Design a protein around this ligand. Structure first.
Ligand SMILES: [Cl-]
Ligand SMILES: [Cl-]
Length: 186
């Protein structure tokens, strides 16, 4: 059912027009995608356990290794990183953009506090249902509270986008970065 869950994820990504927006003065990114097939149920795809675990994300340059969950509810984001519903599931594919968010500034956990230390050329590594996908960081950006940033699919690229979030009512700059799929020798 790992084989199948990954095939289901690709089918979901095929039906989805991925998109997101970082809204002005919003503490979390906003999902902004649509699906040509709503029978592919998000919660049930890449469902590794009953708590909604999807994947793990590693960023060796900042010693990060965290669980990735379905969705970006408040409680989820205190357990780990949230996948932003409306964006591609993190199984790759041409014309995909997967968005994952996590807190900065907490005392109780690091989460994405050191995301600003990530630089172009660094690896982002997704471990998902037994597969390992590597992305190389190609852009980093500070998005100030007053700015709005659309996150759209780019051509036939296979993109992973990470963005910081905060608790509700904490209005501060976001760190946004994107990596593109690469293929290290196995
Ligand atoms: Cl593809
Ligand atoms: Cl805290």
């Amino acid at each position: 059912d790992a084989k199948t869950q990954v095939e289901q994820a690709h089918a979901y990504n095929d039906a989805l027009s991925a998109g997101a927006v970082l809204e002005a003065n919003n503490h979390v990114p906003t999902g902004a995608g649509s699906s040509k097939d709503s029978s592919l149920q998000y919660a049930n795809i890449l469902k590794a356990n009953n708590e909604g675990l999807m994947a793990r994300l590693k960023i060796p340059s900042i010693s990060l290794d965290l669980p990735v969950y379905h969705g970006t509810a408040d409680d989820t984001l205190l357990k780990g990183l949230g996948h932003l519903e409306g964006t591609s599931l993190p199984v790759g594919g041409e014309g995909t953009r997967s968005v994952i968010t996590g807190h900065r500034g907490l005392a109780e956990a690091t989460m994405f506090t050191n995301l600003d230390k990530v630089k172009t050329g660094d690896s982002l590594i997704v471990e998902v249902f037994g597969e390992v996908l590597t992305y190389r960081v190609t852009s980093t950006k500070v998005v100030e509270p007053e700015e709005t940033e659309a996150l759209r699919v780019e051509e036939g690229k296979d993109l992973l986008t990470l963005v910081t979030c905060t608790p509700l009512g904490i209005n501060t700059h976001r760190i946004l970065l994107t990596g593109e799929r690469i293929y290290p020798t196995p």
